Design a protein around this ligand. Structure first.
Ligand SMILES: NC(=[NH2+])NCCC[C@H](N)C(=O)O
Length: 229
């Protein structure tokens, strides 16, 4: 079990794609910070070990996990059926819907998702995310442009090279304040979880127990309100 491996080695290795505010990012001193980071820290404490963060590109984050580059994904990861087939998820630690971001100027042209499903519309998303999937399914006439990082996608919409970007609601809000604008999607919210390799119920139970505990004893709420005020 990875649990044994973790405790022997003395360190918890957390796979994270660390340009994803407010879940995981660098502060002004290039230090790891965010909701997922604080949670990672809490879990490490529970485990009696130190934390090490393993920066990983989002698109390959599941393969990195499956090939043992780290023990656990804590990186704003939505639980999906397709992903459940590859890894195991903890109980939900959060919920996020899909939000559309546009230039304040172009806020007039865009009531909803449907308004983006035209052939002249370019929409930016992070590669390998639920936002990519949502756009590809629900905006098939549009031009979807993908990016390794959200920051570039943000940059594409500001520069005018894209008409919009789709991202998780809490990320969209965080990018808004940086004087661009949000338009909201009523269609679907989904739970986020932490991912681990299959065949490790000791670690899964431990994580779930730990999480359960933090929701019981106030520690989680303190942390939620800290990042989502
Ligand atoms: N750190 C990141 N880049 N996270 C992107 C996650 C986006 C979306 N919640 C998903 O799980 O697909």
């Amino acid at each position: 079990s990875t649990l044994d491996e973790i405790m022997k080695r003395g360190t918890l290795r957390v796979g994270t794609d660390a340009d994803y505010k407010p879940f995981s990012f660098k502060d002004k001193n290039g230090q790891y910070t965010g909701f997922d980071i604080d949670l990672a820290k809490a879990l490490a404490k529970e485990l009696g070990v130190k934390v090490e963060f393993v920066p990983t590109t989002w698109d390959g984050i599941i393969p990195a996990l499956q090939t043992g580059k780290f023990d656990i994904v804590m990186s704003g990861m939505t639980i999906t059926p397709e992903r459940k087939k590859k890894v195991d998820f903890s109980d939900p630690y959060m919920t996020a819907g899909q939000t559309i971001l546009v230039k304040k100027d172009n806020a007039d042209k865009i009531k909803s998702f449907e308004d983006l499903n035209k052939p002249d519309v370019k929409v930016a998303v992070q590669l390998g995310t639920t936002s990519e999937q949502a756009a590809k399914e629900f905006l098939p006439k549009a031009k979807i442009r993908t990016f390794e990082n959200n920051a570039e996608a943000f940059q594409e919409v500001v520069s005018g090279r894209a008409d919009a970007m789709v991202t998780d609601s809490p990320v969209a809000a965080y990018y808004a304040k940086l004087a661009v604008v949000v338009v909201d999607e009523p269609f679907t919210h989904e739970p986020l979880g932490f991912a681990i390799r299959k065949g490790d119920p000791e670690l899964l139970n431990w994580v779930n127990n730990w999480l359960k505990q933090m929701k019981k004893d106030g520690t989680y709420d303190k942390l939620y309100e800290k990042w989502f005020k």
